[PDB]
Amino acid sequence: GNVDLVFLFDGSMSLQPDEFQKILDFMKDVMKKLSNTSYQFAAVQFSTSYKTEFDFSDYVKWKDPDALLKHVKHMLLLTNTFGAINYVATEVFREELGARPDATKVLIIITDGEATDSGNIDAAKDIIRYIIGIGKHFQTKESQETLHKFASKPASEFVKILDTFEKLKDLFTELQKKIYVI
Ligand SMILES: CC[C@H](C)C(=O)O[C@H]1C[C@@H](C)C=C2C=C[C@H](C)[C@H](CC[C@@H]3C[C@@H](O)CC(=O)O3)[C@H]21
Ligand SMILES: [Mg+2]
Numbered sequence: 001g002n003v004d005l006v007f008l009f010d011g012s013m014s015l016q017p018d019e020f021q022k023i024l025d026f027m028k029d030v031m032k033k034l035s036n037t038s039y040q041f042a043a044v045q046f047s048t049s050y051k052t053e054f055d056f057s058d059y060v061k062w063k064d065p066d067a068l069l070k071h072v073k074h075m076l077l078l079t080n081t082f083g084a085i086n087y088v089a090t091e092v093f094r095e096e097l098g099a100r101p102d103a104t105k106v107l108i109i110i111t112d113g114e115a116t117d118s119g120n121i122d123a124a125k126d127i128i129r130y131i132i133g134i135g136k137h138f139q140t141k142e143s144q145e146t147l148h149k150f151a152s153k154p155a156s157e158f159v160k161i162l163d164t165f166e167k168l169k170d171l172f173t174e175l176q177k178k179i180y181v182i
Contacts, residue, residue, distance in 0.1 A: 001038070001102070001103070001104060002038050002040070002100050002102055002103035002104065003038060003039045003040070003103060003104050003106055004040045004042075004056060004093065004099050004100055004103040004104070004105050004106070005039055005040070005041050005042070005106045005107075005108065006041075006042045006043070006044060006088050006092055006093070006105075006106070006107050006108070007027050007041070007042070007043045007044070007108050007110065008044050008046060008084055008085065008088055008107060008108065008109045008110070009023055009024075009027065009043065009044070009045055009046070009109075009110045009111075010023070010046065010047070010079060010109075010110055010111040010112050010113070011045045011046060011047045011074050011075040011076070011077075012047050012075070012076070012077060012078060012079045012111075012112065012113060013047075013076045013077060013078070014112050014113055014137070015074065015076075015112060017074070018165075019112070019135075019165045020074050022165040022166075022168055023110055023165070023168070024069055024072060025168075026110070026168040026169075026171070026172060027043060027065070027069065027110075028065040028066060028069065029172050030172065030175065031065040031068075032065055033175075033176065033179070035063070035065075040056045040059060040060065040098065040099075040100065040103070041054075041056070041059045042054060042055045042056050042059065042092055042097070042098075043068070043069060043072075044084065044087070044088055044092060045072065045075060046075075046079070046080065046081070046083075046084035046087075047075035047076065047077035047078055047079065047080070048075070048077035048078045048080055049075070049077070049080075050080075050083065050084050050087045051075075052091070052092060052097075053068070053069060053071075053072050054068045054069070055092060055097040055098055056097055056098030056099050056100075057097055057098035058098075059098070060098060078116040078117075079111065079113050079114070079115055079116045079117075080115070080116055080117040081109070081111065081115035081116075081117060081150060082115060082117050082118055082119040082120070082121065082150075083117055083119070084109075085107070085109075085121050085123075085124050085129075085150060086119070086121065086123045086124065088107060088124070088127075089121070089123040089124040089127065090123055093105050093127070104128065105126065105127040105128065106127070106128045106129075106130070107124070107127045107128065107129045107130070108129075108130045108131075108132065109129065109130065109131045109132065109150060109151075110132045110134070111131070111132070111133055111134070111147075112133075112134050112135045112137060113137045114137065114143060114146050115146070115150075121149075121150060128152055128158075129150060129151050129152045129158060130151065130152070130158050130159075130160070131147045131150055131151040131158060131159045131160065132160045132162065132168075132171070133147050133159070133160070133161045133162070134161075134162045134163075134164070134165055134167070134168070135162075135163065135164070135165070138161050144159070144161050147159050147161075
């Protein structure tokens with residue numbers, strides 16, 4: 001059918017410049033691969049606050065992933081995940097911003113630490129949520145369990161834990177083998 005996909009990427013202070021970059025490159029790889037498909041994209045950066053780097057309308061209008069994310073400025077603050085999510089839910093998946101009413105709403109969260117806030121994600125009930133946790137902060141099984149609450153059930157299917165940002169490349173290779181013409 002139609003897939004409206006939003007990348008919710010972590011731009012906290014824990015990230016080294018090169019790690020932030022690998023996050024941006026992953027997003028561009030996926031978008032470059034699925035260009036001219038049924039997929040529509042939007043990108044939202046989160047730390048303390050939230051910024052929509054580009055919405056579904058910009059994507060359709062300019063279509064170039066490199067131009068779309070060219071002026072992203074790393075925020076360097078905390079990780080307010082609950083707020084970031086309801087923000088997407090309520091401010092990004094909006095028709096005025098180019099979201100298609102008959103589209104499946106998928107949300108891919110990319111983070112490197114646990115959440116520095118709280119609340120609930122009820123506004124995001126009908127959104128498919130994948131969570132990609134990367135790095136040292138998710139070494140313990142205990143810290144990996146904190147992500148389960150932002151992701152769709154079953155977590156083993158929706159939560160991805162990578163030990164290095166180098167692994168995001170291996171994740172893209174794994175994504176590519178599931179690409180099929182229907
Ligand atoms: C597909 C395997 C890769 C590693 C992956 O998980 O990509 C997931 C997670 C992430 C690596 C990027 C994605 C980009 C596009 C789609 C939404 C993809 C999930 C596609 C699957 C296939 C159907 O069951 C629909 C669905 O809900 O999820 C995600
Ligand atoms: Mg962090």
